[PDB]
Amino acid sequence: TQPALLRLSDHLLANYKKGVRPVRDWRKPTTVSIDVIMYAILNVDEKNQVLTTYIWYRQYWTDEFLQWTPEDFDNVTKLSIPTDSIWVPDILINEFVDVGKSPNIPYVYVHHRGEVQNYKPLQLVTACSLDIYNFPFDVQNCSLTFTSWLHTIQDINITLWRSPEEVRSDKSIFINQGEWELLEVFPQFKEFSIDISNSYAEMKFYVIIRRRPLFYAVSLLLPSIFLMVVDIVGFCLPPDSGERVSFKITLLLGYSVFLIIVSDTLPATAIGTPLIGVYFVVCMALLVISLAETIFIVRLVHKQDLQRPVPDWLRHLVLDRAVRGLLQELSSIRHFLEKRDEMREVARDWLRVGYVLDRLLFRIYLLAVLAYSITLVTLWSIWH
Amino acid sequence: TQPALLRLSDHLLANYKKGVRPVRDWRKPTTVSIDVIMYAILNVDEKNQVLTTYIWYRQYWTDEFLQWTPEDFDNVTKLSIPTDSIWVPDILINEFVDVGKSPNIPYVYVHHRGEVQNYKPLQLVTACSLDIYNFPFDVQNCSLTFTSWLHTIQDINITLWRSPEEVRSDKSIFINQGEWELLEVFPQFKEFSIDISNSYAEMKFYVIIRRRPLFYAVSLLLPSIFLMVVDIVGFCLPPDSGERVSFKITLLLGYSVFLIIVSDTLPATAIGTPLIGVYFVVCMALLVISLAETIFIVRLVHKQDLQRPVPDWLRHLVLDRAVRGLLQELSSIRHFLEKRDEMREVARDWLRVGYVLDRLLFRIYLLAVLAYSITLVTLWSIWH
Amino acid sequence: TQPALLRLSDHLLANYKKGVRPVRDWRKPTTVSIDVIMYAILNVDEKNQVLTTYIWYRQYWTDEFLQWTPEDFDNVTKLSIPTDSIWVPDILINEFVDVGKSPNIPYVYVHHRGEVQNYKPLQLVTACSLDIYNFPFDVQNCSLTFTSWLHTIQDINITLWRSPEEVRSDKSIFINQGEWELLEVFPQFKEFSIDISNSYAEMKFYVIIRRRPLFYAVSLLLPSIFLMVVDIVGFCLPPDSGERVSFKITLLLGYSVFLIIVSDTLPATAIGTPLIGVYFVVCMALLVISLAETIFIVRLVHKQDLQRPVPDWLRHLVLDRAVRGLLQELSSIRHFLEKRDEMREVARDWLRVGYVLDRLLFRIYLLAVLAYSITLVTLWSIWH
Amino acid sequence: TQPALLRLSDHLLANYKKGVRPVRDWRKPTTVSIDVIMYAILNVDEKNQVLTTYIWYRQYWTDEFLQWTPEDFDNVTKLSIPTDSIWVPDILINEFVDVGKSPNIPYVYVHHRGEVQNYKPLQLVTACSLDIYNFPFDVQNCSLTFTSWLHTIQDINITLWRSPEEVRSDKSIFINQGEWELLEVFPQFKEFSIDISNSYAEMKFYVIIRRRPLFYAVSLLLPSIFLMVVDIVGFCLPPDSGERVSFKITLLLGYSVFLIIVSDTLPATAIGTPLIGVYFVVCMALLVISLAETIFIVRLVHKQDLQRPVPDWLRHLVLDRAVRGLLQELSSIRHFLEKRDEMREVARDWLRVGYVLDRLLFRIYLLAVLAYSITLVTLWSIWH
Amino acid sequence: TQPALLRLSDHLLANYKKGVRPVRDWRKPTTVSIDVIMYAILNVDEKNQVLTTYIWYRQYWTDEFLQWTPEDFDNVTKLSIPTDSIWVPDILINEFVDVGKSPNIPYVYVHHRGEVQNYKPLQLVTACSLDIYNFPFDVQNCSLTFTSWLHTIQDINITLWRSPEEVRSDKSIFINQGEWELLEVFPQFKEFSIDISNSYAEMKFYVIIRRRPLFYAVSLLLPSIFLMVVDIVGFCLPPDSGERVSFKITLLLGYSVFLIIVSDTLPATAIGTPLIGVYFVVCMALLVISLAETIFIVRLVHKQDLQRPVPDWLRHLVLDRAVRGLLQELSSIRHFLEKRDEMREVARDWLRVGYVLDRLLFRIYLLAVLAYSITLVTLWSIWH
Ligand SMILES: Cc1ccc(Sc2ccccc2N2CCNCC2)c(C)c1
Ligand SMILES: Cc1ccc(Sc2ccccc2N2CCNCC2)c(C)c1
Ligand SMILES: Cc1ccc(Sc2ccccc2N2CCNCC2)c(C)c1
Ligand SMILES: Cc1ccc(Sc2ccccc2N2CCNCC2)c(C)c1
Ligand SMILES: Cc1ccc(Sc2ccccc2N2CCNCC2)c(C)c1
Ligand SMILES: *[C@@H]1O[C@H](CO)[C@@H](O)[C@H](O)[C@H]1NC(C)=O
């Protein structure tokens, strides 16, 4: 006789119709069992709010036409037949915004009771809501909604292959060393409803992914810390040097270029910018405050050859915390030297005031950045 | 007997022709009812003027060959049959400039009266007219024109599934947290005409989308405001410092780099640049005016050792608003000191004039930027 | 009896062969009439010299096998049959460098005389010659060559559906608000020839597109004008300030960064760079000339404490256009003051010369940029 | 009689079923022999951790239905038949994250014993773990896992065509002049297991690729070396020039721009940044230390007209290693000159201290960068 | 009777098998004649070492089953039949690293002797070895290897349609105005061999393409020449100005930014960087040498108020090539003036030395850049 697989396949696929839903009684829906195993988080685009993942998805349903008695076919209990030869449910993801390029699986396993098993890998580009409020430490909760696109609850119902606890803790194949860490996938069944009669089976997997901040620690924190360090170094220049203000403005321009170039990576959304943006703005205010202090002190100590002398209150407050023709003609010589000396001494008194005030405002700025830095490391421990 | 679905499908699809338009009388057009549900605004490219969206589109038409009496087939009233087994109208969008990658839906529902229901998701890349005059606050009105590509009004006519008010206010599935907010989609029926006989059914959906400015507020307004703040800070430097002009030119270079880098995002069109461009140009004029004032005041107060003394009109106008050999040889000594002192005093008089004029032109510039800023916040309230 | 469309389609498509060219006499070529309607200029890549457009293309040919008498089929005069069921000529564009993603049109109209009408939209990526000599105002003349890829003049000949004047002035559907304005499309028929026998039908449409310069006016002209304005402002700084040369070099660095960033947009070709490049180089020469004048004047007026006094010719040319021990020991005091005063006066004389020469060379540079600017606006009026 | 190939193909492919696994006894698995020949490493994306390669992959299995006696068919021993006409195992790579665009091979060779030979080229985009710890010199070890997607060990088993030593040392077609050098590919057989019964054949090829550092030597090392050279040159400027600190800050800004622009190429991962990042940070610390030394020395030698004189310990430590009205009125003149001279001499003493300390701290910094450079060249020899 | 084309096609394609290689005797290989006509060089990616071209490729082979006597079919000598209806050899390019998007040609010409003619355009992405040693003037020699992927020499042999001299000089359709100029394509036949029996036909076309340097002359040479010009201008600033060193460092930073931005275009390879990189490094050394000369001269002439006087050897070498209380108290006044004057004169002597040495080192640098520029223009003439 002929081989068992040839006889079995010829018996099953003879006068078999792919278009008909395989039920002998049309009132019975084909319950399809869904299982999803996350393999990789290929991309998370916050600008377009799209998530590209790869999953291994296996489903099984009872085909009431692909049934046989194994004892009549040399005790064969299951066989593989082409996917395009049998009816396959139109179960797909609601959140699609594209089609994913994935290998086509040509065969499906069929058991002697009709239990067709369809294993396939598929790449999904799905629209998801991304909360970028705490960008470097954000936890994204994206829904993949498997449902029959056309058939209602009365034709195709969806159940879960494994128990929800098993699929929740499944990380057997996930590519872990990416930017995103898979926390869990959470299945939940519900019915979509257009009206009373048009109700659709639905299975939502809540893929939860946490961003790894070690990708971005160097990218954001290190340059800003450098800039603050150099700013703190810049106060050691004397206020009367004239280069100190140029130093400060050059540093501000550099950190502004840093902000501009970083903004191509730091994303944004309509709900609001990440708190990293707020801390960058606070760093900006700190640098602008340092520049304004430098400019004020430069205005204070300038050798402008016009200064009235320091007022008594200012002086005390600062220093508490620090032959007749020949005779008359020589008098003009000493008067001009005295006029220059008195003017020069006045400029020194302003310089003496401006030096210690530069020191005093350096300590306050030193403490202000110290309090700000300790506040940041405290909040980081909470996010960590 | 055989199962109802097998018998029904075999009866319907036997000697069924896909190429023929399913009408028993060829004079009757197949009225196709169109429904469009916007799911996401994937992209709006102003440079190329193309809009990429995703829609859920459902249509239904009466197939006069897919009719049966349910009482003869075990009371089955509707069944799903493959899309590629039956005639499907060639209804597509006129504004296509590409093909969208969308899932292929294999099945369609058919009721016992022949009412075929085709549900499918599709991504559309369509040419649209984008008015970028008020870029951060623009409201775009893009037309999606569903029509039968080949069949005229005498073969395929297009109606609307739901009432126009229902489709106008449909936001049940729209992904809202993107850059674009869907205001409404507006359906309108009209007939395209090549001649008297060649008239085509047409249904234009006017997708109206408003850009969310919170994406761009930080991107444009914040750096410019920073630059103006630093410019205002720069006036506190003394005019005779010599660094003030370097400060101003460095700031101008920084803001020019800001303009250059921002222009990769701020789009343009043949109709005209956005008013944001005009306000950036006005900010540019303000910075150039501040730089010119700095350069003029520096030219005024310079210690050039060549100045003639301040004219009487200028002085008043500004200050209203603020042994014989031994004897003759010593006279040369006091004369040279007097010559230096008189020259030094003249330089001081120019400095006294230039100081208050720097203050006076600082107040005017302070008020000019204040009036400009209040004007901007007033117009923003209207756009908001 | 059966419906007319079913009977007609069954009669036509029974024993119909798609592979055969539909002529009862094989000597008669199938004359295909071509019509092209430009819809959008999607992209013009000057770097790769490729033009991506979208067209609505309709063709019609006489199929001698799809003929019937309408009075025998309930007076049906035309019917739509699937495109993949009948012979379709292999007419495509010679200039292809890719395949365009375009919707597939499933049906074609067939009249009772056999006149098959095939309407289809198609995106074309075609190699074209782009003359970038006058880049902002260039008029590109790109050829789309529709021809039968395989069949010679003896099998497929190509004619034009409409008169050439009608297709020349066709702008009914063109998307006008893009960067490119369609001037006309010009059809011309010719025969390609490999040898005497192997001659091919050919129809060249000369798509002529003019770039809209309002896209680029802001992008190129405005920043350069700004830079020149600031350069003109920079001369007001005194030559002895020392900051003027730093101002000029900073401005030159800024405009060089402008040139670098702009070059990512301004294209180039082997024939030659656009004249915009030449005018940018002339602006570069103007800025370098201003910098060299600043450096020369700074070298002239420096307080170098070493200057020999101004020569008589230079002075006139410039100013035409502007007790014994006690006695001897006091003499040394007045001599040292005289030595310093004479040296100081010499430095003033050089400064007096350098000041007016700075003014004189400022007027010449002011006129040179004025002549250059008026020359540019004159040539712009010709291009406009 | 008919030609041998026609008769043989007609005999083989008559009543041949593609869906059945070609075994006369269904208990016998189809052992498929796998061979992989690497052709090119198209891309290694460290950001997404994906490897795109091209391979020539040949497989062979025994088809028990495609068997014939050559003496009955004119001594034909093998023939090519279309790939889509016979059963082909569903062997693919587990690590897929996309589908590769590769030519479709239409034919396969079949020998008279049934040995089908399938040669095909395929592009693979596979997820791989990339260790970027020593980025310029890293050796990546990426797994390509060929397995039957559906069939278990009981239906399809996988062996190796050639001996493992032959495939390990195979570089016959590899494109060598790319960025990556193929060290070896290592085959290893194992069984995947879902449970006791569901075990799958598996063949892992460990493609080992070493990056060529000559691509990146110029990109990273050369600019940093330049920056250090210029920094070393900058110490030759006198500390009192005032421009030295501006020189240092400008150099620091330039090298920071270098770091920013380079970071678009230097990748990162969650495990940790490459040691090149650590050496760049050490270079950053060196530049900041040089800037701080410059600022400290500038603070030390400033002509601030306020300095108390150098303390005795500091001085020694540094220098070890380097008519009554007329009479009284003239006394004021010499006193004022003495007051200025003593103040001027004090400023000189501070300058004398700061000069040699600048030299002394220049030698230490010269030795520190020398030790750092020699340390780098030593470690480079180990990596080389 | 029926039309000739219908009868002929029905006679030929009845019981015609596509899978069989069309030979009546299986020992006779099907000699396929190859012809390749280059149409465009779409892209040359030196980073990935891939060449994307477009070719018109025509092949012809003798099909021994598609033969007829024309006198029996109304004297028809050739006819077009669908490509997918007849056997087509699996000839493709070995160097594929992708699949090219090209139009599908549906028909092929068949003559009455069986000579099938297959014309088709195809885009090829092929791995090629790119020698970037002389990047702007490089001549690339890339191999396209047409061979039968599966069939050996015993089944499919490959010959050339035209004589090798005709295909060598073929430029009839090449798009010439691109970046690459096609010098020639060179065909050569060889046999690949796996073993003694498994030998494969092979035809290598050596596409030779020369880069047009006019694309890049402006891109590289012009900015560097500008930078050198400005550097030469910078020497005219006096050494004691203090701004000269700032000028030089700003220029160096600008040219470094130029190098950084240019490196995104100038490619690299493992064999070695292009000589343009070496000349850029030499320009870098020239700028660093100019900066070091400026810093040295600034160190030489500084008004540091500490200089010992110029040594006798240095001076000559440089200048060869250029009442008791009242009496004693007045003596202190002249002594202090003498002390200041002698110190001031010493600073002048150092300035006199440093001025001419700046001139002398300017001439040497002027000649060094002149020799370097003449050397470059000489080598350019050889490359040109
Ligand atoms: C008002 C309204 C009516 C029906 C729907 S449903 C839908 C609409 C178009 C295309 C497909 C569907 N679906 C049906 C089953 N579920 C998958 C998608 C909606 C959303 C609104
Ligand atoms: C002058 C003219 C004639 C006919 C048309 S129509 C058209 C033309 C080519 C291809 C398709 C069409 N269409 C027919 C039905 N509507 C969808 C597209 C035009 C625009 C101008
Ligand atoms: C020397 C030569 C011979 C023939 C041609 S033609 C050609 C060649 C290959 C593939 C296609 C064609 N074509 C035939 C009909 N026209 C469309 C393209 C040439 C150019 C040179
Ligand atoms: C818990 C668990 C169960 C089964 C698998 S396997 C798998 C799952 C879905 C789709 C395909 C597969 N495969 C089967 C044979 N090998 C190739 C892929 C896993 C991973 C976990
Ligand atoms: C060791 C070795 C054996 C065979 C080959 S050949 C080859 C291998 C796999 C897939 C295809 C081929 N080819 C056969 C005919 N020529 C085109 C490609 C090699 C390279 C090494
Ligand atoms: C099938 O299995 C049964 C036991 O399960 C055994 O008795 C019978 O012999 C088997 N048939 C064949 C053909 O092996």
Q: Dihedral angle at the C-alpha atoms of E242, E246, E247, E249, nearest 10 degrees?
A: 140
User: Residue A83: helix, strand or coil by DSSP?
Assistant: helix
Report the residue from B150, B272, B295 with minimal CB separation from C119: B150
d(C-alpha B359, C-alpha B352), whole Å? 11
Burial class of residue C201, CB neighbours in 10 A (0-12, 13-18, 19+): buried
Residues 8-47 of E with CB under 8 A from D: 17-21, 23-26
User: D324-383 and A324-383 are packed helices; what angle lies between their axes, rounded to 10 degrees?
Assistant: 30
Residue found under tokens 């990189």: E277
H-only helix segments in chain A: 4-13, 164-168, 222-234, 243-262, 275-301, 312-319, 324-383
Atom of ligand 5 nearest to the CA of E94: 17
Q: Token digits for B297? A: 């005041």
d(C-alpha D255, C-alpha D62), whole Å? 64
Domains along the sequence of chain B with CATH: 4-212 (2.70.170.10), 217-383 (no CATH)
User: Residue B43: helix, strand or coil by DSSP?
Assistant: strand
Contacts of A90 in chain B (CB under 8 A): 105-107
d(C-alpha A158, C-alpha A200), whole Å? 9
Residue found under tokens 């330089």: B347
Looking at chain E, the residues that come just before a C–N gap of over 2.5 A are 322
CB distance E61 to E89 below 8 Å: yes
Minimal CA–CA distance to B178: which of B207, B210, B208, B222?
B210
Q: Token digits for B311? A: 């004219």
Minimal CA–CA distance to B138: which of B171, B176, B180, B185?
B180
User: Is residue C302 less than 8 Å (CB to CB) from chain B?
Assistant: no
User: Residue B52: helix, strand or coil by DSSP?
Assistant: strand
d(C-alpha B297, C-alpha B291), whole Å? 10
A82 φ/ψ angles, rounded to the nearest 5 degrees: -60, 145
CB distance C34 to C161 below 8 Å: yes
Minimal CA–CA distance to A21: which of A154, A120, A110, A112?
A154
Closest ligand (CA of A90): 1
User: Closest-CA residue in chain E for D1?
Assistant: E24
User: Is residue E263 less than 8 Å (CB to CB) from chain D?
Assistant: yes
- Alpha carbon distance, N-terminus to C-terminus of chain D: 70
Closest ligand (CA of D199): 4
H-only helix segments in chain B: 4-13, 164-168, 222-234, 243-262, 275-301, 312-319, 324-383
Q: What lines the ligand 4 site, CB under 6 Å?
A: A 37, 56, 58, 119, 172-173; D 94, 147, 149, 192, 194, 200
Neighbour tally for E116: CB within 10 Å = 23
Minimal CA–CA distance to D258: which of D288, D283, D286, D292?
D283
CB distance C142 to C118 below 8 Å: no
Instruction: Indicate which technique resolved this structure.
Output: cryo-EM
User: Is residue C52 less than 8 Å (CB to CB) from chain E?
Assistant: no
Cα D366 versus chain centre, distance: 32
User: Is residue B125 less than 8 Å (CB to CB) from chain A?
Assistant: no
Closest ligand (CA of A58): 4
Out of A36, A37, A60, give the residue to mutate to test ligand 4, the one with the largest number of ligand atoms within 8 Å of its CB.
A37
Q: Token digits for E208? A: 């030779």
d(C-alpha B22, C-alpha B29), whole Å? 9
Minimal CA–CA distance to B179: which of A264, A48, A96, A130?
A48
Contacts of B42 in chain A (CB under 8 A): 48, 50, 97
User: Is residue E218 less than 8 Å (CB to CB) from chain D?
Assistant: no
CB distance E109 to C150 below 8 Å: yes
CB distance A103 to A123 below 8 Å: no
| Residue-by-residue DSSP string for A265-319 | TS---SS---HHHHHHHHHHHHHHHHHHHHHHHHHHH---S-PPPPPHHHHHHHH
Q: How far is the CA of C40 from the centre of ligand 2 (A)?
A: 14
User: Tell me, what amino acid is at B220?
Assistant: L
C115 to chain E nearest CA, in Å? 19
User: Residue E295: helix, strand or coil by DSSP?
Assistant: helix
Q: Dihedral angle at the C-alpha atoms of D147, D149, D151, D157, nearest 10 degrees?
A: -10
Contact E250 D247 (CB under 8 A): no
Contact B218 A250 (CB under 8 A): no
d(C-alpha C370, C-alpha D229), whole Å? 45
Contact B177 A270 (CB under 8 A): yes
CB distance A64 to A24 below 8 Å: yes
d(C-alpha C266, C-alpha C223), whole Å? 14
d(C-alpha D191, C-alpha D158), whole Å? 10
CB distance E106 to E82 below 8 Å: yes
Q: How far is the CA of C85 from the centre of ligand 2 (A)?
A: 23
DSSP one-letter code for D128: -
Q: Beta partners for E326?
A: none
Q: Beta partners for B193?
A: B199
A125 φ/ψ angles, rounded to the nearest 5 degrees: -105, 110
Q: Give the list of residues 6+ apart from residue E167 with CB closer than 8 angstroms, or none.
A: E35, E36, E37, E160, E185, E187, E205
d(C-alpha B318, C-alpha B297), whole Å? 14
Q: Beta partners for B122?
A: B55
The arrangement of strands across the sheet holding C156-160 comes to C78-82, C107-111, C115-127, C50-62, C30-45, C156-160
Burial letters for C256-294: b for 16+ Cβ neighbours within 10 Å, e otherwise? bbbbbbbbeebbbbbeebbbbbebbeebbebbbebbbbb
Q: Give the list of residues 6+ apart from residue B186 with CB closer than 8 angstroms, or none.
A: B164, B168, B205, B206, B208
Minimal CA–CA distance to E260: which of D62, A202, D220, D136?
D220
The arrangement of strands across the sheet holding D107-111 comes to D78-82, D107-111, D115-127, D50-62, D30-45, D156-160
* Ligand 1 close to Cβ of residue A145 (< 6 A): no
CB distance A110 to A139 below 8 Å: no
User: Tell me, what amino acid is at A333?
Assistant: I
* Ligand 3 close to Cβ of residue C145 (< 6 A): no
Burial class of residue E372, CB neighbours in 10 A (0-12, 13-18, 19+): middle
Element housing D328 (H / E): helix D324-383
Query: Half-sphere exposure (CA, 13 Å, Cβ side) for B150?
Result: 25
Instruction: Name subunits touching E (3+ CB pairs < 8 A).
Output: C, D
DSSP one-letter code for A96: B
E81 φ/ψ angles, rounded to the nearest 5 degrees: -130, 155
Burial letters for A225-252: b for 16+ Cβ neighbours within 10 Å, e otherwise? ebbbebbebbbebbbbbbbbbbbbbbbb
Minimal CA–CA distance to C226: which of C251, C253, C249?
C251
Burial letters for D181-205: b for 16+ Cβ neighbours within 10 Å, e otherwise? bbbebebeeeeeeeeeeeebbbbbb
Q: Dihedral angle at the C-alpha atoms of D91, D97, D101, D104, nearest 10 degrees?
A: 10
d(C-alpha C333, C-alpha E32), whole Å? 110
Give CA angle at B26 (B21, B27), nearest 5°.
130
d(C-alpha E285, C-alpha D222), whole Å? 12
| Count of H-run helices and E-run strands, chain E | 7, 10
Minimal CA–CA distance to B106: which of A93, A59, A90, A94?
A90
Question: H/E/C letters for each residue in B106-171?
Answer: CEEEEECCCEEEEEEEEEEEEECCCCCCCHHHCEEEEEEEEEECCCCCCCEEEEECCCHHHHHCCC
Q: Dihedral angle at the C-alpha atoms of C335, C341, C344, C349, nearest 10 degrees?
A: -120
Question: H/E/C letters for each residue in chain C?
Answer: CCCHHHHHHHHHHCCCCCCCCCCCCCCCCEEEEEEEEEEEEEEEECCCCEEEEEEEEEEEEECCCCCCCHHHCCCCCEEEEEHHHCCCCCEEECCECCCCCCCCCCEEEEECCCEEEEEEEEEEEEECCCCCCCHHHCEEEEEEEEEECCCCCCCEEEEECCCHHHHHCCCCCCCCCCCEEEEEEEEEEEEEECCCCCEEEEEEEEEEEEECHHHCHHHHHHHHHHHHHHHHHHCCCCHHHCHHHHHHHHHHHHHHHHHHHHCCCCCCCCCCCCHHHHHHHHHHHHHHHHHHHHHHHHHHHCCCCCCCCCCHHHHHHHHCCCCHHHHHHHHHHHHHHHHHHHHHHHHHHHHHHHHHHHHHHHHHHHHHHHHHHHHHHHHHHHHC
